[PDB]
Design a protein around this nucleic acid. Structure first.
Length: 324
DNA sequence: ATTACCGGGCTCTGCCATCTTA
DNA sequence: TAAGATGGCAGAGCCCGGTAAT
């Protein structure tokens, strides 16, 4: 009845909203006013509230009480109201897509029961909020899948692998077990790779790899192989390089290639590059920016130690002064 | 005094398909 | 038999600085 006019006053993108959840508009009762007041109660700007609703309309169908109990359960994990406003601005659906506050509460029990610390639950929730809308069974699945993979390989107590992984890869619990499995095999296959080596890879420098979508790791490594092969890098060189800096798989193929070229267009050998993988941390902008700075003093780059291209502003800028 | 080695800190969706449920 | 609840998917880095090494 009064619905559409409210949303207009609230600043909502009504057309977008209708298309995302049309069933919300076929309802004889809605709590849009309650919700606005509630969020205003907790710090949220009028604009944010509109954005929120625009993207997840079903939000307006929750009761003040439900909202309050959920919010309080988030406060058992995050410490301030402002921290929660900010999360919801970036990810409304995670808060509003369920209304099962019992299940939420059990997740939290379960996560504690698995040995994670508040510091960690806070980390999950802040970066991977949607963890807390998973059903209990779904969070169990994954956790049991990790435990399994823990003991399937050398690790003495999976309990502590689980934590290492979840700390380093706070996005692990909202990936399918399918996806994660495949990325593990891809790793095992393509490289050495005995249980011990693999474990350290997964908990550490290549933890991101487990979150890559189906066949993306295959296809990015391929492009890495081809691109380096094309430059006279043997396969062995190629492996040592990627195992020493597995992060490089995440880059989009064009981004990797570009980077290689923009360096090498300035007469930096491929050999110089793969022997100092970390230079690829820098953005292309950071790279060319810095490349112009240096050639623009006496440096020839052909024979310079290039580690500095990926140093901090301070260490880099310091060294640049000294070179003029 | 200066570089190497290595690990940390930010990282926070939005959509579509497929069940449940009332 | 329609909404709500849930699972699952593609996407595609950068930067800083403590401490060891020299």
């Amino acid at each position: 009845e009064d619905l559409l006019k409210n949303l207009l006053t609230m600043g909502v993108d009504i057309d977008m909203a209708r298309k995302r959840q049309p069933g919300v508009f076929h309802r004889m009762i809605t709590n849009e006013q309650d919700l606005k007041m509630f969020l205003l109660s907790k710090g949220a700007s009028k604009e944010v509230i509109a954005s929120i609703i625009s993207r997840y309309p079903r939000a307006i169908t929750r009761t003040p009480e439900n909202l309050s109990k959920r919010w309080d359960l988030w406060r058992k994990i995050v410490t301030s109201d402002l921290e929660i406003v900010n999360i919801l601005e970036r990810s409304p659906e995670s808060f509003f897509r369920s209304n099962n506050n019992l299940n939420l509460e059990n997740n939290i029990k379960f996560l504690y029961s698995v040995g994670l610390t508040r510091k960690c639950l806070c980390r999950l929730l802040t970066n991977a909020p949607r963890t807390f809308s998973n059903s209990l069974d779904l969070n169990k699945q994954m956790v049991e899948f990790l435990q399994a993979a823990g003991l399937s390989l050398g690790h003495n107590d999976p309990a502590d692998f689980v934590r290492k992984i979840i700390f380093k890869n706070p996005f692990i619990l909202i990936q399918s077990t399918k996806r994660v499995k495949a990325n593990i095999e891809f790793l095992r296959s393509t490289f050495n790779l005995n249980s011990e080596e693999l474990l350290v890879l997964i908990c550490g420098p290549g933890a991101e790899i487990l979150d890559l979508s189906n066949d993306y790791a295959r296809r990015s490594y391929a492009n890495i192989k081809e691109k380096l092969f094309s430059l006279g890098c043997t396969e062995e060189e190629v492996q040592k390089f990627v195992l020493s800096y597995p992060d490089v798989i995440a880059l989009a193929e064009k981004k990797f290639n570009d980077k290689i070229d923009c360096l090498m267009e300035e007469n930096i050998s491929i050999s110089q590059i793969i022997e100092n993988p970390r230079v690829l941390d820098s953005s292309i902008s950071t790279l060319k920016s810095r490349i112009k700075e240096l050639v623009n003093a006496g440096c020839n780059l052909s024979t310079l130690n290039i580690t500095l291209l990926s140093w901090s502003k301070k260490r880099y800028e310091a060294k640049l002064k000294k070179l003029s």
